[PDB]
Design a protein around this nucleic acid. Structure first.
Ligand SMILES: [K+]
Ligand SMILES: [K+]
Ligand SMILES: [K+]
Ligand SMILES: [K+]
Ligand SMILES: [Mg+2]
Ligand SMILES: [Mg+2]
Ligand SMILES: [Mg+2]
Ligand SMILES: [Mg+2]
Ligand SMILES: [Mg+2]
Ligand SMILES: [Mg+2]
Ligand SMILES: [Mg+2]
Ligand SMILES: [Mg+2]
Ligand SMILES: [Mg+2]
Ligand SMILES: [Mg+2]
Ligand SMILES: [Mg+2]
Ligand SMILES: [Mg+2]
Ligand SMILES: [Mg+2]
Ligand SMILES: [Mg+2]
Ligand SMILES: [Mg+2]
Ligand SMILES: [Mg+2]
Ligand SMILES: [Mg+2]
Ligand SMILES: [Mg+2]
Ligand SMILES: [Mg+2]
Ligand SMILES: [Mg+2]
Ligand SMILES: [Mg+2]
Ligand SMILES: [Mg+2]
Ligand SMILES: [Mg+2]
Ligand SMILES: [Mg+2]
Ligand SMILES: [Mg+2]
Ligand SMILES: [Mg+2]
Ligand SMILES: [Mg+2]
Ligand SMILES: [Mg+2]
Ligand SMILES: [Mg+2]
Ligand SMILES: [Mg+2]
Ligand SMILES: [Mg+2]
Ligand SMILES: [Mg+2]
Ligand SMILES: [Mg+2]
Ligand SMILES: [Mg+2]
Ligand SMILES: [Mg+2]
Ligand SMILES: [Mg+2]
Ligand SMILES: [Mg+2]
Ligand SMILES: [Mg+2]
Ligand SMILES: [Mg+2]
Ligand SMILES: [Mg+2]
Ligand SMILES: [Mg+2]
Ligand SMILES: [Mg+2]
Ligand SMILES: [Mg+2]
Ligand SMILES: [Mg+2]
Ligand SMILES: [Mg+2]
Ligand SMILES: [Mg+2]
Ligand SMILES: [Mg+2]
Ligand SMILES: [Mg+2]
Ligand SMILES: [Mg+2]
Ligand SMILES: [Mg+2]
Ligand SMILES: [Mg+2]
Ligand code: NA
Ligand code: NA
Ligand code: NA
Ligand code: NA
Ligand SMILES: [Zn+2]
Lengths: 255, 81, 50, 47, 72, 55
RNA sequence: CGGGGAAACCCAGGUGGAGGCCUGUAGCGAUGCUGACGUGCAAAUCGCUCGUAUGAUUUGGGUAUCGGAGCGAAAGACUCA
RNA sequence: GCAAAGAUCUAACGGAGAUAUACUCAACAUGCAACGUUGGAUACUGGAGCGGGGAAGGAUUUCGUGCCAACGGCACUCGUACACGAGUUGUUCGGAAACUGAGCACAACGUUAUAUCGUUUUGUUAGGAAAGUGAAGGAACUGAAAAGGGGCAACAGAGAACCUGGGAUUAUAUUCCAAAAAGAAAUUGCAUGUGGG
RNA sequence: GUGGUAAUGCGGCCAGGUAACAAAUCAAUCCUCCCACGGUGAGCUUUCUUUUCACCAUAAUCCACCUUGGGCCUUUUUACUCUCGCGUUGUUCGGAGCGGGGGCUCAAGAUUGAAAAAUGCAUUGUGAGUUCUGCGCUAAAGCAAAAACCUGGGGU
RNA sequence: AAUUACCGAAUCUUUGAACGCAAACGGCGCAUGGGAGAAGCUCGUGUCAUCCCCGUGCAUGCCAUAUUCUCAGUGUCGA
RNA sequence: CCAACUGCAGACCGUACUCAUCACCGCAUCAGGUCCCCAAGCAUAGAAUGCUCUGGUACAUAGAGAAAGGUACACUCAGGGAAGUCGGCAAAAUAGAUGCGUAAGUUCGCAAGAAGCAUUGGCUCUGAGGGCAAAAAUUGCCAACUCAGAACUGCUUACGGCGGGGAAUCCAACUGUAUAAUUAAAACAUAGGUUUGU
């Protein structure tokens, strides 16, 4: 046979990110001495849109702590942030929308976004538009904090990790039907070469395990083992169950 | 259609002259020669084409210096008094 | 067209100078074997492509 | 070319235009100053 | 090209060392004096014929004088 | 009859930087002359409104 | 902007110029005549007729991905007849 | 068989290409057919042109004189054929000097029996000591500052100081023109006065 | 360095700006075509034709300084009191300052001259077209970057 | 000897491992030594700014070396 | 040090010609293919189509000339009108603009140019639609076109260009893609729906 498309995508080539129009990575400030001991105050200068991203980005200007110059930061903007607003980041920052505080200083039951999984990572959780995390509890003896993630799972992180107060802007995006093939074309133009999609049963046996036959059909079960080699692991990978879900929907993911 | 009509669609050129070997074998996009592998330091040489080796070996050119040094060796590096 | 590297222009110049017939007094030499240039080139028959 | 003209024929050139011929040689049109006569210089050379 | 609107300024230009020559143009309505310096060509315009003749004279002989005529 | 013109410089494409105008010469001929690009002028900072400055 | 109504609202006339909208050049294609030709104008062309023609549109130059491999709105299509 | 794209006619010059005869004989019935140039006539292309200029590609096919063996599937006194001799002129036009983009891959490091392999723009090489001169200080020296090596990739993106006239060629011209430069300008480098400080 | 109440006029390092960017509608510049009124040449002329055709040009670079389209200043501001007013073909604007009087400034034009007649060939008034320019700047699509240059904040 | 044969003295353009930096560019540098110079300065001479021309050195890695060159280390000591 | 002035000097490469029914690719001077700029007059909605001033061209083997049979970007036919044929293939037919009028069905947007009826030339007139200056609800000057109405007088229905229509069944929702050189479709894609891993 020949190589399957899912395996071919791993070489890179014509399947990489279209990033020419993007403004750069979005991240928090660097966890420095001022952030660890006091606070820093910056000003929001502009709010902008980036190709391929549903949330708005904010440019925030700070003063350099050691030299005579200005520093510009690009961050994911929570809903309600406006130009001219003051942003406080550090240990002694007050509790308000847009500020960045250590998790140990945030009251239980609060809504946060742009959460650091590890201290100094500059934000890796709850970044897509309309998403957020919920603080559950603190453990002062262990120095840890419990969080509920957008997926519904629960995670424990060190209390030194930082977070921003509020929810990510741009929520409600997926409620509007697309209605046209051209709209999907423009939607994926800013992201990558992954559209349109061709069904596996519409291909030939040389290219896909589902191809061939005098009827369009899969001749074997479409649930495949976790141990299947690349080129064979297509379909429903290591599925615990199939079919329409009756009753409550369980939380997805590993134990 | 393939054939006569498509022959008129061929524009530009893949290869140009090579600075090192002089053949029309220098790939413009990749910036390397298909005949002598310039700008690699060493040249192409393959034993599956001995006929091609005989076309490029020593003695197929001028040998401006080799002729002189061959004479000096044969005369044991003679010098005057 | 108008554009060409100077090295390319010099190669074309040499080919122009070589496109000449044999001088007549060559045929009168002792032991001569040459009658025509036998390497004459015409722009419509064979292309140089450089 | 301006300097060589002064050193060889003791004339002053006010303008030099050059071109490379299709046969590979280089040709120069050299205009002499009004103090000299090109025809007189040509006779001395031997044209 | 530059224009001068004073006889006193015109004499200064004519007295300059760079003035190669002066050209006199006779029009039906007026007379023009054009001085050729190194960079610019200065023009003085007069409307009285009697003043033009006086200005035509009293010019330094070092500066060349040219009468502008149609050439064939 | 009506005259037609040609590009007189070495660039023969109609881009924003190669705009031409039609001029009639004292010799009664119609030629093309290149018109220069223009600047937008001095503005206030982009984050403050980006407006032209008087004077 | 005119008329009606207690109120919620209803009826009529203009302005404006939206749409993977319609007729139709250039362009991009190729339905039928199972037309011409079928040792040809041509190792796939010609004539009339026909699809679409502001968009998932057409096109120049540059640049990236290949032979147990590449690419593919998927025909085992295409990768210098 | 040499049938798509409508089409030629006439007179005079030119040319060996004619009005070319054994008897008879006024001429026809015994030298046909075909060619270049100029002047007339008649048509076609019909500005999305068998118009005037460029890129890719070609490289002397351009121009003058001559010539008609072969070639221009008929013809030629003609030719993009053959022979000889000529022609391309820039401070300002295009490129480079001197930008960055999709991108490339020298150094460095690592890997491979094997470098002819990999990394090399998400501000950016390399376990990584990659900055070589501002001022100075008494006329060459000497050393403070500033993180992230050296390059290439656009003749349609960015950038770019010049215009007309000519009786000025056989062929080049926003490139040639000479003291009345036909002339009128703009701009770069270095020096000399004048004025101000 | 210095004027004006003001908009603004004239003689190492750090921060901004130009370069620098999609449409449509309306009005358009150079230019092209047409008409009218006059000059010059040519054509037709059995008959008619105050007639038919052609031409009547102004380069770059510099002086001086009325139109209409934006931005702003000052002064009147019981301006929207009880159907408030200004404005576009058009989807709107105003106590966060409309309209009126008087001004400052920017952009595109117009006019006067130098060039320039010494050149070229043998004229100055209206309608139609025309992307320079102005009208400030669909989308789950929101429209490259840098060199080079300009101005300012400090300091000397 | 424009004869030939052989060889000890010489010349030897642009490139190429190609090595100052690049390259569909007969392109562009730093240091040093020269050359020419219708400007200006000076008494036809001398001198010469900007521009122009020529020779030499300048890749990376490794070995040896410095009349004993200049440095770095919360490495080990010492005063 | 700064401003005009002035003096001197402004280096390198390209530059002929072509860009195509003869200069490039297709074995060739091949009815195939090949990117950009300028684009006149009349008819007309017009870059449709037809003819024309400027510029260009008369180059494509020709002469004589009513055989049969052919090809055509060529026509016409009495009476009947699909009886032909697998099949209305091919041909014929409709046709611009303006007024009136228009069914079932429907996701209320359409269906729809549904279907169908009527007018149209030439000439001589009348009315309406504006700009600028001085109950100015008035006086003078002037430009460019369009629409409507009337009388008279004609047709041989007369360039070019330009939808035939209706009643139903099967399939796919729709625009789109696709076997270069025998298959353009009911195949692929699509918005929408569901599932899996993290
Ligand atoms: K795709
Ligand atoms: K199957
Ligand atoms: K199938
Ligand atoms: K130490
Ligand atoms: Mg990437
Ligand atoms: Mg299939
Ligand atoms: Mg299989
Ligand atoms: Mg199925
Ligand atoms: Mg299986
Ligand atoms: Mg070439
Ligand atoms: Mg030159
Ligand atoms: Mg349509
Ligand atoms: Mg057939
Ligand atoms: Mg199959
Ligand atoms: Mg025959
Ligand atoms: Mg025939
Ligand atoms: Mg035939
Ligand atoms: Mg024919
Ligand atoms: Mg005869
Ligand atoms: Mg004739
Ligand atoms: Mg044409
Ligand atoms: Mg022949
Ligand atoms: Mg020849
Ligand atoms: Mg010759
Ligand atoms: Mg990377
Ligand atoms: Mg890059
Ligand atoms: Mg780098
Ligand atoms: Mg450019
Ligand atoms: Mg230039
Ligand atoms: Mg010519
Ligand atoms: Mg009010
Ligand atoms: Mg080198
Ligand atoms: Mg030329
Ligand atoms: Mg052309
Ligand atoms: Mg032909
Ligand atoms: Mg052809
Ligand atoms: Mg009309
Ligand atoms: Mg047409
Ligand atoms: Mg037309
Ligand atoms: Mg033929
Ligand atoms: Mg013919
Ligand atoms: Mg017949
Ligand atoms: Mg009949
Ligand atoms: Mg009937
Ligand atoms: Mg039957
Ligand atoms: Mg039919
Ligand atoms: Mg109904
Ligand atoms: Mg109807
Ligand atoms: Mg119906
Ligand atoms: Mg369908
Ligand atoms: Mg469509
Ligand atoms: Mg379709
Ligand atoms: Mg097929
Ligand atoms: Mg399907
Ligand atoms: Mg469904
Ligand atoms: Na980017
Ligand atoms: Na419309
Ligand atoms: Na036309
Ligand atoms: Na789907
Ligand atoms: Zn080579």
């Amino acid at each position: 046979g020949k190589t399957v498309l899912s395996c071919r995508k791993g070489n890179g080539s014509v399947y990489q990110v279209h990033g020419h129009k993007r403004l750069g990575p979005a991240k928090l400030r660097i966890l420095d001495y001022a952030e660890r001991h006091g606070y820093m105050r910056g000003v929001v200068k502009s709010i902008e849109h980036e190709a391929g991203r549903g949330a708005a980005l904010a440019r925030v200007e700070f003063r350099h702590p050691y030299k005579f110059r200005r520093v510009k930061e690009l961050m994911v903007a929570p809903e309600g942030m406006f130009t001219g607003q003051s942003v406080f980041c550090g240990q002694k920052a007050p509790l308000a929308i847009g500020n960045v505080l250590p998790l140990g200083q945030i009251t239980e039951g609060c809504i946060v976004c742009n959460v650091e999984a590890k201290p100094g990572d500059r934000g890796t959780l709850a970044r897509a538009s309309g998403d957020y995390c919920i603080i559950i509890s603190h453990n002062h003896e262990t120095g840890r904090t419990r969080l509920k993630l957008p997926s519904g799972q629960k995670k424990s992180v060190p209390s030194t990790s930082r977070a921003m107060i509020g929810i990510i802007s741009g929520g409600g995006r997926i409620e509007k039907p697309v209605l046209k093939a051209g709209n999907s074309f423009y939607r994926f133009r800013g992201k990558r070469n992954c559209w349109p999609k061709v069904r596996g049963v519409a291909r030939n046996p040389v290219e896909h395990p589902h191809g061939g036959g005098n009827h369009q059909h899969i001749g074997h079960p479409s649930t495949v083992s976790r141990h299947s080699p690349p080129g064979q692991k297509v379909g429903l990978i290591a599925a615990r169950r199939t079919g329409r879900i009756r009753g409550g929907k369980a939380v997805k993911g590993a134990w | 259609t393939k054939g006569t009509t498509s022959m008129g669609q061929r524009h530009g050129r893949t290869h140009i002259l090579c600075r090192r070997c002089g053949r029309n074998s220098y790939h413009v996009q990749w910036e390397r020669c298909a005949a002598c592998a310039y700008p690699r330091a060493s040249r192409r040489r393959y034993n599956w084409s001995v006929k091609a080796i005989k076309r490029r070996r020593t003695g197929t050119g001028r040998c401006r210096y080799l002729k002189v040094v061959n004479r000096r060796i044969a005369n044991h590096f003679k010098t005057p008094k | 067209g108008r554009f060409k590297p100077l090295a390319v222009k010099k190669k074309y110049a040499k080919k122009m100078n070589q496109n000449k017939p044999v001088p007549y007094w060559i045929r009168l030499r002792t032991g001569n074997r040459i009658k025509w240039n036998e390497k004459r080139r015409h722009w419509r028959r064979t292309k140089l492509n450089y | 070319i301006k300097k060589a003209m002064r050193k060889l024929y003791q004339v002053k050139a006010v303008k030099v235009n050059t071109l490379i011929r299709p046969d590979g040689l280089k040709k120069a049109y050299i205009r002499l100053s009004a103090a000299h006569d090109a025809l007189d210089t040509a006779n001395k050379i031997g044209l | 090209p530059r224009e001068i609107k004073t006889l006193k300024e015109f004499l200064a230009i004519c007295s300059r060392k760079d003035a190669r020559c002066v050209k006199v143009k006779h029009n039906p309505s007026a007379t023009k004096f054009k001085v050729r310096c190194s960079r610019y060509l200065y023009t003085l315009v007069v409307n009285d014929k009697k003043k033009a003749d006086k200005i035509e004279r009293s010019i330094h002989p070092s500066v060349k004088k040219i009468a502008v005529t149609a050439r064939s | 009859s009506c005259p037609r013109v040609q590009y007189r410089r070495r660039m023969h494409y109609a881009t924003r930087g190669n705009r031409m105008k039609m001029v009639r010469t004292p010799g009664n001929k119609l030629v093309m002359q290149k018109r220069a690009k223009r600047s937008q002028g001095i503005h206030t900072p982009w984050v403050l409104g980006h407006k032209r400055l008087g004077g």
